[PDB]
Design a protein around this ligand. Structure first.
Ligand SMILES: C[C@H]1CCC[C@H](O)CCCCCc2cc(O)cc(O)c2C(=O)O1
Length: 272
C-alpha cells in the first residue's frame, strides 16, 4: 500500500457504496415475468439471436425449474424472453442508481449532471457488475437462485458482449479494481448533456490515478505488467459495446415495445 490518505479514502467510499447497493445474491429480485407456458426485421432477428441462453431457477426447497429457448422460426418466438430481460435490467439499474447516490463526489454534482451521467453509464456499470458473477469455465452468469447459461463454441466469442466478459474475467481483478472501473466509467466527462465537463473530468482523472497507484502497490507480478492499461482499453471497448447495444435496444423497442418505465427514462423515451 503506497496510496495517499485521500486515495485510501476514495477506495473505502467506493467499496462502501458497492457493499450497500450490490445485491450479490439477488435476494431481492422478485416478481419478475417469465416466458409463457421489413429489413428492419431481419435486423431485429439478427439483433436478438446473438444471445441465446437457457434459464435455471433453484427453489428455496430444492426443486429446479429449467427453461430451454425456441429455435428461430421466423415469428414472434424470439420475443418470449424480453419481459424477463427488462425486469432484470430494471432491478440492476436500481442498484446502480443507489450506488451513485451514496458516492459523495456524485452527490456534489448538480442534479442535471447526475442524470446525464447515470443515463450515460448505467448499462456499463451493470455489465461490470455482471462480470463478477460470470463463470467463464461454464459460460454462466450465476445470480443467486438463478442462472443464465450460454447455449451451444468459439464462434460464441465473436459476439463482442461475450468477448468482453471472457476477456475481463481473465484479468482476475480484485473487488477494489472493479469498483474503481465503475467510478471511472460513471464519471465520464463526455456523456451527452454533461455541464460540469471540467469537474467530472478531474474526478475521473483522480479515480484513474488511484487505480494505477493501487495496481503498482499490490500487483508486482510479471503477469500484471500493463494491467492498468489493459483495464483502460476494456473500458474503451465497453463504451463501444454500450453504444451498439443502445441502438439495438431502440430498434427492437421500435417494433416490439418491452422497455419498463425506468428503462424509458434512462434511454430518453418520453411516452409520446
Ligand atoms: C445474467 C445477464 C447477463 C447479461 C450479460 C450480457 O448482457 C450478456 C448477454 C446475455 C444475456 C443473458 C440474458 C438473457 C435473457 O434472455 C434474459 C436475461 O435476463 C439475461 C441476463 O439477465 O443476462
Amino acid at each position: 500500500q503506497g496510496l495517499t490518505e485521500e486515495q485510501r479514502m476514495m477506495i473505502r467510499e467506493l467499496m462502501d457504496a458497492q457493499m450497500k447497493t450490490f445485491d450479490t445474491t439477488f435476494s431481492h429480485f422478485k416478481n419478475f415475468r417469465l416466458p409463457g407456458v421489413a429489413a428492419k426485421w431481419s435486423q431485429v432477428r439478427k439483433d436478438l439471436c446473438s444471445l441465446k441462453v437457457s434459464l435455471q431457477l433453484r427453489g428455496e426447497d430444492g426443486s429446479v425449474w429449467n427453461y430451454k429457448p425456441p429455435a428461430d422460426s421466423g415469428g414472434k418466438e424470439i420475443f418470449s424472453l424480453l419481459p424477463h430481460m427488462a425486469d432484470m435490467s430494471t432491478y440492476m439499474f436500481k442498484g446502480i442508481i443507489s450506488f451513485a447516490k451514496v458516492i459523495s463526489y456524485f452527490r456534489d454534482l448538480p442534479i442535471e449532471d447526475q442524470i446525464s451521467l447515470l443515463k450515460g453509464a448505467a448499462f456499463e456499470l451493470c455489465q461490470l457488475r455482471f462480470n463478477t458473477v460470470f463463470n467463464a469455465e461454464t459460460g454462466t452468469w450465476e445470480c443467486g437462485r438463478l442462472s443464465y447459461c450460454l447455449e451451444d463454441f468459439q464462434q460464441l466469442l465473436l459476439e463482442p458482449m461475450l468477448k468482453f466478459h471472457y476477456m475481463l474475467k481473465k484479468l482476475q481483478l480484485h473487488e477494489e479494481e472493479y469498483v474503481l472501473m465503475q467510478a471511472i466509467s460513471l464519471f465520464s466527462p463526455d456523456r451527452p448533456g454533461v455541464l460540469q465537463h471540467r469537474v467530472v473530468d478531474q474526478l475521473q482523472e483522480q479515480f484513474a490515478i488511484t487505480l494505477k497507484s493501487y495496481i503498482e502497490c499490490n500487483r508486482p507480478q510479471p503477469a500484471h505488467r500493463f494491467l492498468f492499461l489493459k483495464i483502460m482499453a476494456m473500458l474503451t471497448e465497453l463504451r463501444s459495446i454500450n453504444a451498439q447495444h443502445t441502438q439495438r435496444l431502440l430498434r427492437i423497442q421500435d417494433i416490439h415495445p418491452f422497455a419498463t418505465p425506468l428503462m424509458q427514462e434512462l434511454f430518453g423515451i418520453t411516452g409520446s
